[PDB]
Amino acid sequence: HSSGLVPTMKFNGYLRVRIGEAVGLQPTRWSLRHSLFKKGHQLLDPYLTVSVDQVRVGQTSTKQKTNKPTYNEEFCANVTDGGHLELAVFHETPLGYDHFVANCTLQFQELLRTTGASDTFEGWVDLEPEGKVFVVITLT
Template sequence: MVVFNGLLKIKICEAVSLKPTAWSLRHAVGPRPQTFLLDPYIALNVDDSRIGQTATKQKTNSPAWHDEFVTDVCNGRKIELAVFHDAPIGYDDFVANCTIQFEELLQNGSRHFEDWWPRMAFEYCQTQICKLS
C-alpha cells in the first residue's frame, strides 16, 4: 500500500442535497419531515487522526464552507470526510462520508496534485498534496 509523507492542503467547499437520516428525524415534529433542515459540519481525518472540522452551518441541506486545512502527514493512507448533523440533544448524527486514498492522489507521480472530488454528498472537495523531498 502507498503511504504519503508531506504537506496536505485540503479545501472543503460545499455539500449539496444532504438528506437527513431517520435517526436525525427522531425529534422532528409536524407532518413534513422531508423539509427537515440539517445543521451540518464536516469532520476531516487523515487515517485515525482528526485534523480539522468545519464550522456548523445552520438550517441547510446544501451548506457552503470554503474552509482550508493544512497539516503535515506522516505515513498517511487515506483522507476521511464525514458529515454530521449538530444535534441539540445527545450525540451528533452521522449524515454521509467520503474516503479518498492517498494512492489515488499520487498516481500521476507529480509533486503537486490538485483536483476536485465529487464524491457522495460532497459537491466539491479540493485537495492539494505536496510531497517532501
C-alpha cells in the first residue's frame, strides 16, 4: 500500500467569474481578409465565452467596433472534477460562424495556489496570441 496518499487533484466547488476590461485584441489574418476586409477600420465586434473543461458556462454580450471591450459581466457555475477554466475571445461575424481571436486557460490549481488564504483572484491574465483581460475569479 502506497504511503504517498494525496491529502494530484481536481476542483469541486462553486466558481464565480467576473470579466472586466480586455485590451490589445488583434484581428486574425482570417478576419482581416473576410469580415474586416476593406471596411475603413479593423476593429472587432468581440465577445468572450467562459468554459469549464470544454463545457460552456457563460457568454458575454458582443461589443461593437472595439479592440478594447469593457464587459463588467459575471458568470457562475457549480464545478465538479474541474481541471481548468477557459476564456475565449471571438469576433461576431454578420453571418455564419464567428471567428476565433484569442484565449487563456487557467488551471483551478494555479488559481488556488495563487490566492492562498483568499478565495478571490483579481488581475490581468494574458490572452494568446495577443491581448489581456482583467478578471475577478472566486473559488469556494
